[PDB]
């Protein structure tokens, strides 16, 4: 049903085959969905290092699954701003494979104690995407499952 309805941009599978997917049995088939920049879709793959892979969502090395990415600039892009979507720019250390962090605590930079107010040397970790219809294909919104 995937091919017939939704055209795809990067349809890739690791450890399994697309055509031979139907005639196989699994006990659990998960499904993780998010929205990533176009040029950062490639960070969703085994291993890899980057802003998204290391600090937001890290896939395991011995990964058995499929990654689906298709453009959404027609719908997901907003009229003049899509500041809703955010990614974790600042984190102390990398994520163990298949992990999640939703903390909005203010990051600490420097040995000086960090107060609640961001100010200087303390930053709000999450940073907002900028989505507008006139942006290039690199910075256009994408949907990855």
């Amino acid at each position, epitope marked *: 049903v995937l091919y017939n309805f939704a055209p795809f941009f990067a349809f890739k599978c690791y450890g399994v085959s697309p055509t031979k997917l139907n005639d196989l049995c699994f006990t659990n088939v998960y499904a993780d969905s998010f929205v990533i920049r176009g*040029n*950062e879709v*490639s960070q969703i793959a085994p291993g890899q*290092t*980057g*802003n998204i892979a*290391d*600090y937001n969502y890290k896939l395991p090395d011995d990964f058995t699954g499929c990654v689906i990415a298709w453009n959404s600039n027609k719908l997901d892009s907003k009229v003049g701003g899509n500041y809703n979507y955010r990614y974790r*720019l*600042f*984190r*102390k*250390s*990398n994520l163990k494979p298949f992990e999640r962090d939703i903390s909005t605590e203010i*990051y*600490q*930079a*420097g*040995n*000086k104690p960090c107060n609640g107010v961001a100010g*200087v*040397n303390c*930053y709000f970790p999450l*940073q907002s995407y*900028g989505f*507008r219809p*006139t*942006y*290039g*294909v*690199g*910075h256009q919104p994408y949907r990855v499952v």
Partner: antibody
Amino acid sequence: VQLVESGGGLVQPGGSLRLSCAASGLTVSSNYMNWVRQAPGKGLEWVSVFYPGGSTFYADSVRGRFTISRDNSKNTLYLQMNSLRAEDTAVYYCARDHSGHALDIWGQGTMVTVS
Amino acid sequence: DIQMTQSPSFLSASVGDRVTITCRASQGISSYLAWYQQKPGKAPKLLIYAASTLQSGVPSRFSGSGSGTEFTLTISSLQPEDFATYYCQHLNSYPSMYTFGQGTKVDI
């Protein structure tokens, strides 16, 4: 916060140098730190980057000969180079990234010439 | 890949008038761009970052506003100490990352 840099001088082609980035006020093991190059009378260029995690990305012109290192004991950032006559003829800068694009705390440059 | 270029290059501006600088980005651009000031023989310092955010210690004299491909910065006051050089940047994907583009020169 101050970022005083040491090292430099003149190194013959095919030689090696290391530069240390001393930072007092910010943690090197917690911020995006990077190296910026500026040949005399020309624009700036980017060399390395070093995330809070064990990650590092290099530019194409400085890949395979340039190695970066961090030591939390001295709270300093090190860059290791295996120089070439046109690869390293510039002042080197040490900076921190606030909002993922802007480098604010730029340290004083160190002259690294090859001859 | 995107290429950052600046149109003015060298300029001549007197104390009385103002100066407007523009740098273009190929294949579109996000809202993240930083402006630097580099007096000769000195390490450059951040002047304007993000979308006209302005920075502590940077005078309200400076103000750089723009959106999309067309980006620009303008100085309102009379420029007592004649500034020298200015640059753009924008962080990119894995291979290139920080792209500064050609510099700009302004003087008396």
